[PDB]
Amino acid sequence: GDLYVAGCGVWLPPPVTTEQALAAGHCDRRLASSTRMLSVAVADKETPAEMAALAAQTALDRSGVAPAHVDLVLHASLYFQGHHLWAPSSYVQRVAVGNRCPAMEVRQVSNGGMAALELARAYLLAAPDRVAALITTGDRMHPPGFDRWSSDPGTVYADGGTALVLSRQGGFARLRSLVTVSEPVLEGMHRGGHPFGPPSPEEQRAVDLDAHKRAYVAEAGSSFSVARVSAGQEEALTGALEAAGAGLDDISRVVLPHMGWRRLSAAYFNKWHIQPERTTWEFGRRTGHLGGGDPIAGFDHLVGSGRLAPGELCLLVSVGAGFSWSCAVVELLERPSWAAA
Amino acid sequence: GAPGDLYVAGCGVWLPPPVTTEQALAAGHCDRRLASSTRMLSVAVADKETPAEMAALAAQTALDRSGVAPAHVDLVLHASLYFQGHHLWAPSSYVQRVAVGNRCPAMEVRQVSNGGMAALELARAYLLAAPDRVAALITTGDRMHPPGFDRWSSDPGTVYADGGTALVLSRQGGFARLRSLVTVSEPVLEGMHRGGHPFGPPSPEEQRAVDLDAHKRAYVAEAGSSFSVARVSAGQEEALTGALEAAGAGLDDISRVVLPHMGWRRLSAAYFNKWHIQPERTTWEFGRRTGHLGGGDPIAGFDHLVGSGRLAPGELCLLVSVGAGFSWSCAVVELLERPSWAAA
């Protein structure tokens, strides 16, 4: 009883070029060069749930699934959703679905999209009469709290929404495997306070992940850190491929996080020895890191541009602070009508 | 019991020291009118502890009491409704590192004040979706401090507490059985807790001091007071009746009702004068000394009832929870035995 992907979609605001960022002083020459980012999607006034809802409408329309058959709505994100004590998943449900199933947030930092997929799968499988689930992501990474170029140097953060419709009934792709790996010993890498003590008091101040990474490594050790990160990634990869009865050579396209060149090279290209041309590198480098929606955006790009053929397998690769890793193997069954040739 | 029965195997809270209404009056946080309308006696307030800390502390109590091995914890879910202290950081992973020490998936679930029950819904699904799974840990934690939040006036009529709660859910066994759990959603009401047009897109970000009363008035003006009240009422009724019917029970069959830790005025309008039940049959006295624990009230309330021996074997408990959105969850829980951590 494998599940299906029935629809997917994105809403991306207009790109800002690396050239404009250089001219505005947001990016410097070394950072442009190390990341090799071409542009990043940047929202003027659209808010995260707004962008999530626009993406959901597209994904639902494409899926053909009726509102009455959406049994769950999960909205994932990693940054402030705009209003405290307010329900962004309810906005998404109101705007994009119009139905009355449960709607809630799921977060797992940059692995939020896949985390929601894990829980949505369980939800659909937990009762015989359930049909589809809507997963969305949305984030808006603006000043003063965040610097999309320098809060986490090496990765350039985008504004935008993504959505996927998961179904037990049918769809244009089959979810062949989905595996999540957890190394919570690394949780201290993304906060202040002692890595093996309680979190430091809250600031305030703009997000600065580099400062926390340096402190974590100083305490835990560089060798320990790198090895444990590599191990988690390896476990998710191998876990997902084995569960689908596949090897990396059987994968036609790999959906990777939208990190800069140097990070992807270290984590993936020079590690697994896969070619960048077989991945979503070119798409990601124009888009930026979409909170927890990268693997949805990248899969959506691959399918919509006809780069994936019936019977071909796609590997989704996602990671977030925590750390958590998810990999999934998806088999494309048919080219959907919204796709290009 | 039967296969697919779910049980509460453990629970616990971590509550920081109470600040009395008197202290709040003296300090200017509260005026005598709010004190009188809410009838609050005290609220749990943390000095230095952060939300995941309090969650992990509560989780340690709940896991120890449950006697469930870390290897048998198949999922960790952490619910909350306010800033967790560090952006792009994983509070659920902190809870996992500190309180569980294992490698199952750990994530956050949020549904505002209904978060604990939303996490319970997904925990239940996760456990039932695979034959081999055993237990799941659910935690809540929140720290409602200035300058971002005013626990007495950010949402007048409810006084917010700092603290953590936790519950261990199991397919294997426990001291209580989950007889039903039902969640209701009325998303037409989402605009009530935000700026922007209630039926248009949200207004730009507001990290600033939270002020719900302002957004609520705006909603009612556009949507209509009559519409607003009726839809809130209907959602609450659907969750209640759905949970009772699913359990084979009527309200008369319920020994204790776990209510949100709201102020007396809000509880009277939504529950006491509507359902015609007595405060003594609810967690009113506990809540009025505790305050609104983010999405964790029904866990703290159930924990209180079991821990103080108020609930007896064979008796049924009704959990009542609600959050902005709006979302409602009700659950019927049957106490099977008095656990060893309880008194009589």
Coordinates of C-alpha atoms in Angstrom, one line a residue, chain B residues 102-344:
Chain B
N102 CA 17.2 7.9 21.4
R103 CA 17.1 8.3 17.6
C104 CA 13.4 8.2 16.5
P105 CA 12.0 11.2 14.6
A106 CA 11.5 14.4 16.7
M107 CA 9.5 17.4 15.6
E108 CA 7.2 20.2 16.6
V109 CA 3.5 20.3 16.1
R110 CA 1.6 23.6 16.6
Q111 CA -2.1 24.4 16.7
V112 CA -1.9 27.4 19.0
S113 CA -3.7 26.6 22.4
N114 CA -4.8 23.2 21.0
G115 CA -1.2 22.1 20.3
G116 CA -1.0 19.3 22.9
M117 CA -4.2 17.7 21.5
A118 CA -3.0 18.2 17.9
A119 CA 0.2 16.4 18.8
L120 CA -1.9 13.7 20.4
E121 CA -3.8 13.2 17.1
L122 CA -0.6 12.7 15.1
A123 CA 1.0 10.6 17.8
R124 CA -2.1 8.3 17.7
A125 CA -1.9 8.1 13.9
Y126 CA 1.8 7.4 14.0
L127 CA 1.4 4.5 16.5
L128 CA -1.5 3.0 14.6
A129 CA 0.2 3.3 11.1
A130 CA 2.6 0.5 11.9
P131 CA 2.2 -2.8 13.8
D132 CA 5.6 -2.7 15.6
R133 CA 5.4 0.7 17.1
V134 CA 4.9 1.0 20.8
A135 CA 5.0 4.5 22.4
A136 CA 5.2 8.2 21.6
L137 CA 6.2 11.2 23.7
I138 CA 4.4 14.5 23.5
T139 CA 5.6 17.6 25.2
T140 CA 4.6 21.3 25.5
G141 CA 6.5 24.3 26.7
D142 CA 6.2 28.1 26.6
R143 CA 7.7 31.1 28.2
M144 CA 5.5 34.2 28.1
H145 CA 7.8 37.1 29.1
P146 CA 8.0 40.8 28.1
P147 CA 8.7 42.6 25.9
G148 CA 7.1 40.3 23.4
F149 CA 4.2 39.1 25.5
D150 CA 2.1 40.4 28.4
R151 CA 0.7 37.4 30.2
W152 CA -2.1 39.4 31.8
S153 CA -3.2 41.7 29.0
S154 CA -2.0 40.3 25.6
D155 CA -5.3 38.3 25.6
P156 CA -7.5 39.8 28.3
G157 CA -9.6 37.1 30.1
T158 CA -6.9 34.5 29.9
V159 CA -3.7 34.7 32.0
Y160 CA -0.8 32.9 30.4
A161 CA 1.6 30.6 32.4
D162 CA 5.2 29.5 31.7
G163 CA 5.8 25.8 32.0
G164 CA 6.1 22.4 30.5
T165 CA 3.9 19.3 30.2
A166 CA 4.3 15.8 28.8
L167 CA 2.4 12.7 28.1
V168 CA 3.6 9.2 27.0
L169 CA 1.1 7.5 24.7
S170 CA 1.3 3.7 24.2
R171 CA -0.1 0.8 22.2
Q172 CA 1.2 -1.6 24.8
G173 CA -0.5 -0.5 28.0
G174 CA -0.8 2.2 30.6
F175 CA -2.8 3.3 33.7
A176 CA -5.5 4.9 31.5
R177 CA -7.2 4.2 28.2
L178 CA -7.9 6.7 25.5
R179 CA -11.6 6.0 24.7
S180 CA -11.9 8.7 22.1
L181 CA -10.2 11.8 20.6
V182 CA -12.0 14.1 18.2
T183 CA -10.7 17.3 16.5
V184 CA -12.9 20.0 14.9
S185 CA -11.7 22.8 12.6
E186 CA -13.5 26.1 11.7
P187 CA -10.8 27.9 9.6
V188 CA -13.3 30.7 8.7
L189 CA -12.3 32.0 12.2
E190 CA -8.5 32.2 11.5
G191 CA -8.6 36.0 10.8
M192 CA -9.7 36.6 14.4
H193 CA -6.2 36.4 15.8
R194 CA -4.3 38.4 13.1
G195 CA -4.2 41.8 11.4
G196 CA -5.2 42.2 7.7
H197 CA -8.6 41.7 6.3
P198 CA -10.3 38.6 8.0
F199 CA -11.0 37.3 4.5
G200 CA -8.0 38.6 2.8
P201 CA -4.2 38.0 3.2
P202 CA -2.4 38.6 6.5
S203 CA -1.0 42.1 7.3
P204 CA 2.8 42.4 7.4
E205 CA 4.7 40.8 10.3
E206 CA 4.2 41.8 13.9
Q207 CA 6.9 40.6 16.2
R208 CA 5.9 43.4 18.5
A209 CA 3.8 43.1 21.7
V210 CA 1.0 40.6 21.1
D211 CA -2.5 42.1 21.3
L212 CA -5.3 39.7 20.5
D213 CA -8.2 41.9 21.6
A214 CA -7.5 44.4 18.8
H215 CA -7.7 41.7 16.1
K216 CA -10.8 40.1 17.5
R217 CA -12.8 43.3 17.4
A218 CA -11.8 43.9 13.8
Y219 CA -12.9 40.4 12.9
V220 CA -16.3 40.7 14.6
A221 CA -16.9 44.1 12.8
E222 CA -16.4 42.5 9.4
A223 CA -17.7 39.0 10.0
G224 CA -20.5 39.9 12.4
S225 CA -20.8 39.2 16.1
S226 CA -23.8 36.8 15.7
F227 CA -21.9 34.8 13.1
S228 CA -18.7 34.7 15.2
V229 CA -20.4 33.5 18.4
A230 CA -22.5 30.9 16.6
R231 CA -19.6 29.3 14.8
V232 CA -17.4 29.2 17.9
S233 CA -20.4 27.6 19.7
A234 CA -21.0 25.1 17.0
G235 CA -17.4 24.0 16.8
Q236 CA -17.3 23.4 20.6
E237 CA -20.5 21.4 20.5
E238 CA -19.3 19.3 17.6
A239 CA -16.1 18.3 19.4
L240 CA -17.8 17.6 22.7
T241 CA -20.6 15.5 21.1
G242 CA -18.2 13.8 18.7
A243 CA -15.9 12.7 21.6
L244 CA -18.7 11.5 23.8
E245 CA -20.5 9.5 21.1
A246 CA -17.2 7.9 20.0
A247 CA -16.7 6.8 23.6
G248 CA -20.3 5.5 24.1
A249 CA -20.8 8.1 26.7
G250 CA -22.9 11.0 27.7
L251 CA -21.9 14.1 29.8
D252 CA -23.6 12.5 32.8
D253 CA -21.2 9.6 32.6
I254 CA -18.2 11.9 33.1
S255 CA -16.7 12.2 36.6
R256 CA -14.3 15.0 35.9
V257 CA -14.0 17.6 33.1
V258 CA -10.6 19.1 32.3
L259 CA -11.2 22.6 31.1
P260 CA -8.8 25.2 29.6
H261 CA -7.1 27.4 32.2
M262 CA -9.0 30.5 31.1
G263 CA -10.6 33.2 33.3
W264 CA -13.9 32.6 35.1
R265 CA -15.8 34.9 32.7
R266 CA -14.7 32.9 29.7
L267 CA -15.2 29.5 31.3
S268 CA -18.7 30.5 32.6
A269 CA -19.8 31.6 29.1
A270 CA -18.4 28.6 27.2
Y271 CA -18.9 25.8 29.7
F272 CA -20.6 26.3 33.2
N273 CA -23.7 28.3 32.1
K274 CA -23.9 26.4 28.7
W275 CA -23.4 22.8 29.8
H276 CA -24.9 23.5 33.2
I277 CA -22.1 21.7 35.1
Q278 CA -20.5 22.6 38.5
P279 CA -17.0 24.0 38.8
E280 CA -16.2 21.4 41.4
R281 CA -16.6 18.7 38.7
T282 CA -13.8 20.4 36.7
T283 CA -10.2 21.5 37.0
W284 CA -11.2 25.1 37.8
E285 CA -9.4 25.4 41.1
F286 CA -6.2 23.9 39.6
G287 CA -6.3 26.1 36.6
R288 CA -7.0 29.4 38.5
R289 CA -3.7 28.8 40.4
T290 CA -1.8 27.7 37.4
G291 CA -2.6 29.7 34.3
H292 CA -2.9 28.9 30.6
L293 CA 0.1 26.6 29.7
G294 CA 0.2 27.3 26.0
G295 CA -1.1 24.1 24.4
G296 CA -0.5 22.0 27.4
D297 CA -3.6 22.6 29.7
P298 CA -5.3 19.3 29.2
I299 CA -2.1 17.4 29.9
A300 CA -1.5 19.4 33.1
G301 CA -5.1 19.1 34.1
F302 CA -5.3 15.3 33.5
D303 CA -2.0 15.0 35.4
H304 CA -3.4 17.0 38.3
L305 CA -6.6 14.9 38.5
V306 CA -4.7 11.6 38.4
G307 CA -1.9 12.8 40.8
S308 CA -4.3 14.1 43.4
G309 CA -6.4 11.0 43.4
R310 CA -9.5 13.0 42.3
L311 CA -10.1 10.5 39.5
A312 CA -10.9 6.9 40.5
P313 CA -10.5 3.6 38.6
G314 CA -13.4 3.0 36.2
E315 CA -14.2 6.7 36.1
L316 CA -14.2 8.7 32.8
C317 CA -12.5 12.0 32.3
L318 CA -13.3 14.5 29.5
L319 CA -10.4 16.6 28.1
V320 CA -11.6 19.9 26.6
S321 CA -9.2 22.0 24.5
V322 CA -9.5 24.8 22.0
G323 CA -7.1 27.1 20.1
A324 CA -7.2 30.0 17.7
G325 CA -7.9 28.9 14.1
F326 CA -10.2 27.8 15.5
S327 CA -9.6 24.1 16.4
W328 CA -11.2 22.1 19.1
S329 CA -10.3 18.7 20.5
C330 CA -12.1 16.7 23.1
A331 CA -11.0 13.3 24.4
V332 CA -12.6 10.8 26.7
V333 CA -10.1 9.0 29.0
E334 CA -10.9 6.1 31.3
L335 CA -8.8 5.6 34.3
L336 CA -7.9 1.9 34.6
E337 CA -5.8 2.0 37.8
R338 CA -4.2 4.4 40.2
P339 CA -0.5 4.7 39.2
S340 CA 2.1 4.5 41.9
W341 CA 3.0 8.2 41.6
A342 CA -0.5 9.2 42.8
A343 CA -1.9 9.8 46.2
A344 CA -5.5 8.8 47.3

